[PDB]
Amino acid sequence: LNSINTNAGAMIALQNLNGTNSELTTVQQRINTGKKIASAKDNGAIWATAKNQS
């Protein structure tokens, strides 16, 4: 396959790159807020429990 109209390897590379970008974003959010569960998106049950305790 030497097609000039598509590039599946580029798609796989972009998928891996987007996964790495998401990992870096979540890690920098943990570094910035100082919390591994800063919102209900992180983990709803433990987040709500912690809000009640606080």
Partner: protein, 54 residues
């Protein structure tokens, strides 16, 4: 007073992130994204060799 301190410490144990591991993950993911960008840049050029055939 001691009970309030216990509850606040419990919230902190429940939610707070461990920055020591975050420090290693940050540098590892920076290197990871740089390698991913390099590999995607290499993958983008797969169609460039086709023009040599003509």
């Amino acid at each position: 007073g001691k009970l309030q301190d216990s509850l606040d410490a419990g919230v902190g144990n429940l939610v707070d992130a461990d920055l020591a591991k975050e420090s290693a993950k940050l540098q590892s993911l920076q290197t990871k994204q740089q390698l991913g960008v390099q590999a995607l840049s290499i993958a983008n050029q797969s169609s460039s060799s086709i023009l040599s055939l003509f």
